[PDB]
Design an enzyme around this catalytic site. Structure first.
Site, PDB file in Angstrom:
ATOM      1  N   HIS A 182      14.692  23.022  25.557  1.00 60.43           N
ATOM      2  CA  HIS A 182      14.267  22.368  26.784  1.00 60.43           C
ATOM      3  C   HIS A 182      14.266  20.852  26.583  1.00 60.43           C
ATOM      4  O   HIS A 182      14.745  20.356  25.563  1.00 60.43           O
ATOM      5  CB  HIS A 182      12.911  22.906  27.244  1.00 60.43           C
ATOM      6  N   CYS A 190      15.997  20.216  33.934  1.00 56.81           N
ATOM      7  CA  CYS A 190      16.302  20.511  32.544  1.00 56.81           C
ATOM      8  C   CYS A 190      17.753  20.108  32.274  1.00 56.81           C
ATOM      9  O   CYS A 190      18.600  20.192  33.163  1.00 56.81           O
ATOM     10  CB  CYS A 190      16.045  21.982  32.208  1.00 56.81           C
ATOM     11  N   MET A 201      16.524  25.271  37.018  1.00 61.25           N
ATOM     12  CA  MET A 201      15.245  24.920  36.424  1.00 61.25           C
ATOM     13  C   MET A 201      14.842  23.492  36.793  1.00 61.25           C
ATOM     14  O   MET A 201      14.979  22.576  35.984  1.00 61.25           O
ATOM     15  CB  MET A 201      15.336  25.050  34.902  1.00 61.25           C
TER      16      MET A 201
HETATM   17 CU   LIG Z   1      14.713  24.543  30.209  1.00 63.58          CU
END
Ligand SMILES: [Cu+]
Length: 97
Positions: free
Chosen positions: A39, A82, A90
């Site tokens: 992430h 992200c 996301m």
């Molecule tokens: Cu992510």
């Protein structure tokens, strides 16, 4: 009043949670990696006041844990996304009332 941005859901789904977050002027917004990594923290853009395109961090960290926290003040709605999970859908947002 002191919130956190969890990256990934228990449904092995790489998404920002809570999708939306609200706080006050002077509050903090933490960020922890739930699952489905890696992430990162790369904001989309914020209105005059803060520097979205600065606080960002493309230093994707594989190591699962609590990335870090950051305090804000400038009122408005902040967005982000992200790096690795840009197509997975996301994305989230933050508010500083
Ligand atoms: Cu992510």
């Amino acid at each position: 009043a002191s919130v956190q941005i969890k990256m990934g859901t228990d449904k092995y789904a790489p998404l920002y949670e809570p999708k939306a977050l609200s706080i006050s002027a002077g509050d903090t917004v933490e960020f922890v990696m739930n699952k489905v990594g890696p992430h990162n923290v790369i904001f989309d853009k914020v209105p005059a006041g803060e520097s979205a395109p600065a606080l960002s961090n493309t230093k994707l960290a594989i190591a699962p844990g609590s990335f870090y926290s950051v305090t804000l003040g400038t009122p408005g709605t902040y967005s982000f996304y992200c790096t690795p999970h840009r197509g997975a859908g996301m994305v989230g947002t933050i508010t500083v009332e």
